[PDB]
Amino acid sequence: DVLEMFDVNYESPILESFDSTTQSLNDVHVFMSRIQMSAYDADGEGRIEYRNLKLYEISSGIFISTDRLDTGASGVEDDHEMVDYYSSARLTREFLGESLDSQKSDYFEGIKKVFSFYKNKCNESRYIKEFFEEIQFRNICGFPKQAGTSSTDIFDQFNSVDVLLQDPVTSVWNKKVGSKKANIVIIPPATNLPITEACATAGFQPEGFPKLGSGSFFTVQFDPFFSTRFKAHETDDVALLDPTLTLLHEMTHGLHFQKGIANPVNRSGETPAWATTWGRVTGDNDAFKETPMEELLTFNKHTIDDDIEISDHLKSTYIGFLYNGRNEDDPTESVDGVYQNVSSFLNQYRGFEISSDFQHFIESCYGVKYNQESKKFIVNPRNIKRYVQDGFFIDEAKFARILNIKTRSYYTLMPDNLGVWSYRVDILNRLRETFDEDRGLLSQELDFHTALTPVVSENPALELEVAGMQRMVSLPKIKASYLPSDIKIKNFTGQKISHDTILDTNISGIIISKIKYKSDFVVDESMPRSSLNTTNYNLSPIKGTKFETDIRDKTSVKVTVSEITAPMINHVMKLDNSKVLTERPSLNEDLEETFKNTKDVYIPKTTAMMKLKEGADQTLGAVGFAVWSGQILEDLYNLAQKKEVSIDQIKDDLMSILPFYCAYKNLSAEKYEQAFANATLDAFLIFATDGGGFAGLGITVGAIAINSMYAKAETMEAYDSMFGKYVDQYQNDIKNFTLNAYVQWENNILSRLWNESRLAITGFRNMLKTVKTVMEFDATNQAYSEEDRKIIKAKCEEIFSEFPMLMQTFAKNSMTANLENASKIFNDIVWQKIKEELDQYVIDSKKYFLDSLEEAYNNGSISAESYYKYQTEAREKFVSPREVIDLYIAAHDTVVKRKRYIRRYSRKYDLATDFKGNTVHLNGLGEGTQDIQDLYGNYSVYADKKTVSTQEGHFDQTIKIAKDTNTINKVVLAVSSNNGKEYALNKDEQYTISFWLRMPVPSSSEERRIFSYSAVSGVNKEVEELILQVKNNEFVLATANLLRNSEFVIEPRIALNRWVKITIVNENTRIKVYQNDNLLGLIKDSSRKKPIAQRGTFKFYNYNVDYQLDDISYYNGTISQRDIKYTFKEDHGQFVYDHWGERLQYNKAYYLLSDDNKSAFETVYETKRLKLKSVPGVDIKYLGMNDRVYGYYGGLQFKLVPLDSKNMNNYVRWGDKFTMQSIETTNLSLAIIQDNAYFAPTQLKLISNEGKSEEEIFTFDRNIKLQNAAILVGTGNSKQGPISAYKRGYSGDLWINGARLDGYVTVVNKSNYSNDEIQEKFKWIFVPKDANWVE
Amino acid sequence: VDKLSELTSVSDAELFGIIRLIKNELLSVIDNFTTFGDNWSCPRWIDYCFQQVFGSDLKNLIVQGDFEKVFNISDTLILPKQLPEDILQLKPYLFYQWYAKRYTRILRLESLFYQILNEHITLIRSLVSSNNKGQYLQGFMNDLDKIAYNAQYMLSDWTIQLGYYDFKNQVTQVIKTSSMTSEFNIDDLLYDYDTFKLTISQFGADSINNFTPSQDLKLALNDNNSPILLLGNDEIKSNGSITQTDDSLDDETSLLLSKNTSFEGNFSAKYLLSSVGVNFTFKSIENLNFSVDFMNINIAFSNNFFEITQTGQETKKYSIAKLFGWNSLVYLIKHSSVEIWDIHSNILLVSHDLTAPQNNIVKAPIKLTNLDNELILKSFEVFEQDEEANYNDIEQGFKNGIIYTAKKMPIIVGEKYALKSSILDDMGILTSDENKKYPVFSTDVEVESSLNIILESTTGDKISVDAGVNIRTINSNGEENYLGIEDNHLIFVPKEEAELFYLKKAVVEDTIDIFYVVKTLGNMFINVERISDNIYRLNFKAGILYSTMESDMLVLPAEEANTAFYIQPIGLASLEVKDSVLGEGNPWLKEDNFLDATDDYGNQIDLSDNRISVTGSVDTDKVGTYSVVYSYTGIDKTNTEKATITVKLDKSSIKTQDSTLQNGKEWVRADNLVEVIDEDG
């Protein structure tokens, strides 16, 4: 249906005769055409020309060419490489041992195999299907209709490619026979571009400034046979950019070109300031870096180590500024926007009676509706906001999450020279099986792909020198190496409102809740895909160039700065690797003297580097090195812990700093703590200079001024227009001011401190590469003994194995400090100054409104009705805005979205994660018999249907696994993340597998196996890593991928019919095991043998009892004991649980026990008074042993009847009041009744519940959310109201204790002394009569 | 140090400034050790004590080998000269031997830091209580009590952490340095942390309640069964009728505050570093005018505006959304700010800056005067909270189990609701198709027959998420068609072939609303699939792709909002108009005589909607009455409201001429203004 490809070959004949009658133009598939290109000349001057090209309509609207249009010279010599491979021979001459026709035949068969892969990904995901539809089948409309195109004509240069035949009089292909529907054109990279440069361009760019909403087909210059290398998120694990994602990045660029929202342009023609982000390095001459927000939205990747991203509220601000435009005080810098350009385009048809196929052509283009009466297009300012919003519904980051392929932007490519960038991708599987059509590239490890061999390889660089000094710092020329500039403060001024002023209406401020669901694309098979209209166009050379996305800047700027910038501090902290070390690294503690030697490494003045500058004492052998290196590792962890300071600027809050941040101001880490007394908010900036001058935190907000009223007519209607309009612009000025204040905070503070967060994680990673090379140089010290070097080099490689977790711990703390700083600067500096300015704006505008309203009434320029109308209006409108609360809810949704990112952070991630960090969601999606399926699509579940079931159970659904008493070690459930691709293997891989397990008591020691994780050690290879089994009458978590392979005996009895949670944090060296939330122990003192990846299988085996599972999870990195406790409490949700770990239920027979003795109630001999009696234990056999475990089936059973009875299977939550009804006698319920004839005057009794009875309403103590148990609270009310203190004994809440002679009750103390000591809560247990527990 | 040096007097402002530094000195922790133990939560002030004595901190001199030197531990564990028949039995023997030989030497340096901690807090009690007399002071001494009690438990917990990784190290060294059990399961002799820690000390810093309980408002009866009213444990005053009502959000009761009905308690923040507040649930019926007077701040909710007055400061009015049904509100009083939170959706409502210094430590009363029609209170707790306690991170909803409409009233079995989709709002109307076999969401404006929804359970009336329902579907006439499933399509079935649907509470990413997914027992979730430009199907898909099962909720991504449904009430359509007496020449717009309208679901809409047509105009030049018909054209019914606009004749002139008075000429009005005539002339 979607990418249904036509029978078109490279060998298919071109159209040479059409005849116009017998055969349709929709059946023409190879033909000569014309695509608009940005040609260049010998002068280097750009001009927008048309080029002839043989087309091949490979699918229903998608054309490809194989020509390489002669678009002027590259200017770069053959076989050179700046960062992309420049050649003139590819698809023009014989290039790399293959002929021109073989390169031309491969590029056809190569592109057609890329789209074969997308069609196989069309049916496996709705989210890719909705993309290829929205981008192939879309109606495309362009506004300023050119010469030769009539109005009411659905095919023109914007959405069609001409079909040309050859003249009889000459061999020129220009005899136009019609034009068929175009959406995509895929050509090779042209002559003026490098071989590896994918760039998307609007197909037709008219002369003049592009209008927002003016759609076009998009041209992509993409070659799938070449890629460039990238340094992945996995540190120094270099990979190759997947070309099937590089095309999907440009189609994402091209969907914007089809909608018209890709080149936002003002009236003066330049890009508006709200559509780019600017970097800056100041010095001798200024260097800047522009990254447009269309690039930030096409690769909207939400990680710390990616600068090319914006938040969901900053995205919506840009989406809303494309929709409604943005008026400036200078009207030549205003933006027209989509709504004011579609509406100025559809009003040309307001009295003209367009056709039916043209009307449906627009009504699907812009979602508008056309009425038969009044001859006009009714335009809706919600379907155009829905039109621009649905243009950005997907991005390269969401494609790389669906398609598990790793990526990094071209706009953040750091030349860490591991050699050559440009590689040969073999998409036709000529040498080895490289790229399937079902799955994409079968690797990204660049040992597969043949590296190109260039002659000259010059990476572009930013050359920074300090003024009075001599050391060149060639930074990468990317956005990371520049200071992210503040946005210009707005300073809202007066309006001078008249009765005729056309003030904006569709302005929305901050939107809090929005369903951003891109509405499904309806197909229309009854619309033409061609037109037989020979109409000559204007193909004259337009002087200029077309807006091409993804153009790679290849210049090199030399700036002589005054101050050393953080990017430079980051640079000189790096060991300057490339050599083989002969002498020791000259570690230098002073930053301004490191820039004087061009050989020193700048170390910070911490007690980790001062113990590294001074080596180990060689007099002490292996032992002195272990104490030296061990102390350095501890002193580096002290730089990683965030510590709170106090500022006079921030009241009521302690701002956070990491000790490491002293490295960026050249302080001693204790003089750095001195500088926070008598401080400002322009501290906390590790990166506070652009190179020339101080660049402080832009917390200043523009002053918002009240509007004026100027009536030009003196009628009563002219004042009712003016007094209405003044309130209308009052609400418009607030909605723009609270929106300008979110973007000032989200850019100047949140984005600045997040960038200083990732400049710190880079610099800490660079100084850890200095710790590595100095401890490695000191390990090869010849003054050491040669059998002490075996111990010393093993110690250097053990401190190195802790760098992983140190740099995670540093990143989780550097992010948490800088996010809470940006959160606290909002709450205390920015949002306070918004609230302080808008309070004066609300008050002064009300004072101005109600002094012109009383002036106009007393003069008589307004009626008595209108004066009373606008007096009630000022009382209801000129009030404290709810947009300063919407500004709060916006800025605290971005922080929560980043507080959640820090919680799920991993140093190395492979699979597309959750927001909890999990990569697995097994669900039991079946009609009658449930087949288990991963709902994140990361895992493939094999579930043997004879034994693996799926029930309702623990939290929602369990995976029951049946007995097998005959055949041991049979895998029945296997949840694999192994595709069969080649992943980046490493020994430095951490993960965390976790699953709930309910197992009854096993009597037999059959030495079977329960569960085995097996991580990927290669290509369709897997090494067992973590085996849970029965080993010697005890459950043992063995280990199979360590150098020594220790075991770990699970001592706590986990198989006693109770829901346990087994978490296994497998770090490299340590393997921590957790039962529920408590650390059972470690497997330490051994590293990983075989390198693995973060993909693997979760083989759950058959056991000799029916066990269950639930929430089987896999996390890409380590989980803290702090975060394991938090996850464990939040997994339980809002339910009160049984002892077995299952949620409590009303109308269910529960043994009520005491959780300490496990003692149960019992009636005194004949009366209805209760006596707590002890419940005897159970002699079990647990794995062949003779364990003695807690008994639970004793004493009185109690239902929990709700307050009006519903039915049984309803669950009990925290705060649910009930009534404990006896079961052995159904007519009795628990109550607390005062007798004054026993020692306990306020006993707990069984009273009659017949009719209007005063049985006690109980509850559980909501303020103590325990698991597996809860504290009963007698509420003191009945179903007839509150119980009399004469009948009861007390009036309020009573905890239910295990103490007679208190009457098993004590008063809940709520006085101002109850938290002076420890509360001593009395926990009770509810055991239902379970069938897997016998006594 | 530099705070307590450059001070000759402790101000009431510097009381808060000091107690945050003592909280940052004695409760600050260095986190990571990662060798000789992983969870080593050492307090910051103790390592500074070890830094000042030995030059390096305690991590840098456990690595050196000075753990047994600086703790004066001069002994290691030893196995007995006769091991038991089971070497499992020397598991607690080494726990008693390590306790005597090595832990009580750690425990004797815990004694010294407990004395240094107490002598430091004694000094700041001396330097402040002698240099500050003020009403805040008892909050400072109460909070220094809390930091002392917590730091004494953090010091207690840190020696168990030091103890555990020393016990772990001594048990490996006692059997590696013996040939009797040289190779043995050391994990059979070690303890897990929570059995080692709870054997030594049952309580730690996690067992401390940081704040006192929340003082529930409650009805009660005396020994003379007189109707008293509690606030926690202490009887409070009551001024009018406070009775019980079965009208609750859940199947509990609720308090009926009648008109002009009030209680009055007392409250005080025990600590300086606390926010104090009022957490309460109420049914937001129209014309509610109650007012909570808490900690010398009056917070008056009135006609969906908030008025907050500090005692002796200016009243500031605050505009909110119209609160529709059962609302949970928290009236937080912070330092320098009063914040009102919605706790259903966990969003801020009002944030009022306190212009006067707020003292929450003195006892101030807690009123609630009702002032208008009967307030159905459910809860009323006066609590005291941490000052940095966020209401953002809490997942939203009542957390109740009951299914609520979009206007937060619970769903009753019957009552004829309206399914709405989340993709397409109220504007997307559930209807039947041309063949009368499918329910269809039609986003047309010419929808003929809407289809309302009746859920039914033969259980309790407030429908639980935990109970499966049958969904009848009744149109404008009364044709009742049960919803069933065949070929993964929601169709119409008979009663006996209906299907149990399970509404489950869900949220999508970038919204604050609570939606519901509709599943079956087979995890088949109703998706809204688009088939035409204006017509949407209801087709079942197996599970929700990329959906996260949270507590009991689903966290849908923004791409899976097909499955998100919500429910609205019906027959709430309204249109209110007025009769404006105009004058000859005085202008008229159609919005002048229009008061308020309301959708079928209760949404407050205005005249700019495409459903309210104004059929008729005026002249304002002739004297005749003019009737203007306002009409809201709904989905099934169209209600018209007559609005007459008279134009009363006005002839208003105050014609004047100029005058010159004489020598001190006494002045009256009559010498100038000559022609003055009223409206009728």
JSON list of N, CA, C and O in Angstrom, two decimals, chain B residues 265-278:
[
{"chain": "B", "resi": 265, "resn": "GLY", "atom": "N", "xyz": [-9.98, 25.84, 65.23]},
{"chain": "B", "resi": 265, "resn": "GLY", "atom": "CA", "xyz": [-8.97, 25.09, 65.99]},
{"chain": "B", "resi": 265, "resn": "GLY", "atom": "C", "xyz": [-7.80, 25.96, 66.34]},
{"chain": "B", "resi": 265, "resn": "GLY", "atom": "O", "xyz": [-7.95, 27.20, 66.48]},
{"chain": "B", "resi": 266, "resn": "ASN", "atom": "N", "xyz": [-6.65, 25.35, 66.51]},
{"chain": "B", "resi": 266, "resn": "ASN", "atom": "CA", "xyz": [-5.39, 26.09, 66.72]},
{"chain": "B", "resi": 266, "resn": "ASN", "atom": "C", "xyz": [-4.30, 25.34, 65.97]},
{"chain": "B", "resi": 266, "resn": "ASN", "atom": "O", "xyz": [-4.38, 24.08, 65.90]},
{"chain": "B", "resi": 267, "resn": "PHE", "atom": "N", "xyz": [-3.33, 26.05, 65.44]},
{"chain": "B", "resi": 267, "resn": "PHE", "atom": "CA", "xyz": [-2.17, 25.35, 64.85]},
{"chain": "B", "resi": 267, "resn": "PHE", "atom": "C", "xyz": [-0.93, 26.19, 65.00]},
{"chain": "B", "resi": 267, "resn": "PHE", "atom": "O", "xyz": [-1.01, 27.39, 65.22]},
{"chain": "B", "resi": 268, "resn": "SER", "atom": "N", "xyz": [0.20, 25.53, 64.82]},
{"chain": "B", "resi": 268, "resn": "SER", "atom": "CA", "xyz": [1.53, 26.15, 64.91]},
{"chain": "B", "resi": 268, "resn": "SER", "atom": "C", "xyz": [2.52, 25.25, 64.21]},
{"chain": "B", "resi": 268, "resn": "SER", "atom": "O", "xyz": [2.49, 24.02, 64.48]},
{"chain": "B", "resi": 269, "resn": "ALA", "atom": "N", "xyz": [3.40, 25.82, 63.41]},
{"chain": "B", "resi": 269, "resn": "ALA", "atom": "CA", "xyz": [4.54, 25.07, 62.87]},
{"chain": "B", "resi": 269, "resn": "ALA", "atom": "C", "xyz": [5.51, 24.83, 64.00]},
{"chain": "B", "resi": 269, "resn": "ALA", "atom": "O", "xyz": [5.95, 25.79, 64.58]},
{"chain": "B", "resi": 270, "resn": "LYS", "atom": "N", "xyz": [5.83, 23.58, 64.31]},
{"chain": "B", "resi": 270, "resn": "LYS", "atom": "CA", "xyz": [6.80, 23.22, 65.37]},
{"chain": "B", "resi": 270, "resn": "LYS", "atom": "C", "xyz": [8.20, 23.69, 64.96]},
{"chain": "B", "resi": 270, "resn": "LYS", "atom": "O", "xyz": [8.91, 24.16, 65.84]},
{"chain": "B", "resi": 271, "resn": "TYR", "atom": "N", "xyz": [8.57, 23.60, 63.70]},
{"chain": "B", "resi": 271, "resn": "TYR", "atom": "CA", "xyz": [9.95, 23.86, 63.24]},
{"chain": "B", "resi": 271, "resn": "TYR", "atom": "C", "xyz": [10.02, 25.13, 62.40]},
{"chain": "B", "resi": 271, "resn": "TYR", "atom": "O", "xyz": [9.00, 25.62, 61.91]},
{"chain": "B", "resi": 272, "resn": "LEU", "atom": "N", "xyz": [11.22, 25.66, 62.26]},
{"chain": "B", "resi": 272, "resn": "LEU", "atom": "CA", "xyz": [11.40, 26.85, 61.41]},
{"chain": "B", "resi": 272, "resn": "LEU", "atom": "C", "xyz": [11.45, 26.37, 59.97]},
{"chain": "B", "resi": 272, "resn": "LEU", "atom": "O", "xyz": [10.91, 27.05, 59.10]},
{"chain": "B", "resi": 273, "resn": "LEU", "atom": "N", "xyz": [12.17, 25.29, 59.71]},
{"chain": "B", "resi": 273, "resn": "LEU", "atom": "CA", "xyz": [12.36, 24.79, 58.33]},
{"chain": "B", "resi": 273, "resn": "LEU", "atom": "C", "xyz": [11.21, 23.84, 58.03]},
{"chain": "B", "resi": 273, "resn": "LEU", "atom": "O", "xyz": [11.42, 22.60, 57.99]},
{"chain": "B", "resi": 274, "resn": "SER", "atom": "N", "xyz": [10.04, 24.42, 57.85]},
{"chain": "B", "resi": 274, "resn": "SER", "atom": "CA", "xyz": [8.84, 23.66, 57.47]},
{"chain": "B", "resi": 274, "resn": "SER", "atom": "C", "xyz": [7.89, 24.60, 56.74]},
{"chain": "B", "resi": 274, "resn": "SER", "atom": "O", "xyz": [7.85, 25.80, 57.04]},
{"chain": "B", "resi": 275, "resn": "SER", "atom": "N", "xyz": [7.13, 24.04, 55.82]},
{"chain": "B", "resi": 275, "resn": "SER", "atom": "CA", "xyz": [5.94, 24.68, 55.24]},
{"chain": "B", "resi": 275, "resn": "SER", "atom": "C", "xyz": [4.77, 24.08, 55.97]},
{"chain": "B", "resi": 275, "resn": "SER", "atom": "O", "xyz": [4.79, 22.88, 56.27]},
{"chain": "B", "resi": 276, "resn": "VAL", "atom": "N", "xyz": [3.76, 24.88, 56.22]},
{"chain": "B", "resi": 276, "resn": "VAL", "atom": "CA", "xyz": [2.56, 24.41, 56.96]},
{"chain": "B", "resi": 276, "resn": "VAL", "atom": "C", "xyz": [1.41, 24.51, 55.97]},
{"chain": "B", "resi": 276, "resn": "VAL", "atom": "O", "xyz": [1.48, 25.34, 55.03]},
{"chain": "B", "resi": 277, "resn": "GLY", "atom": "N", "xyz": [0.36, 23.72, 56.14]},
{"chain": "B", "resi": 277, "resn": "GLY", "atom": "CA", "xyz": [-0.70, 23.74, 55.12]},
{"chain": "B", "resi": 277, "resn": "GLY", "atom": "C", "xyz": [-2.01, 23.15, 55.58]},
{"chain": "B", "resi": 277, "resn": "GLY", "atom": "O", "xyz": [-2.12, 22.71, 56.74]},
{"chain": "B", "resi": 278, "resn": "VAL", "atom": "N", "xyz": [-2.99, 23.19, 54.68]},
{"chain": "B", "resi": 278, "resn": "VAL", "atom": "CA", "xyz": [-4.33, 22.59, 54.90]},
{"chain": "B", "resi": 278, "resn": "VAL", "atom": "C", "xyz": [-4.66, 21.69, 53.71]},
{"chain": "B", "resi": 278, "resn": "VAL", "atom": "O", "xyz": [-4.89, 22.22, 52.63]}
]
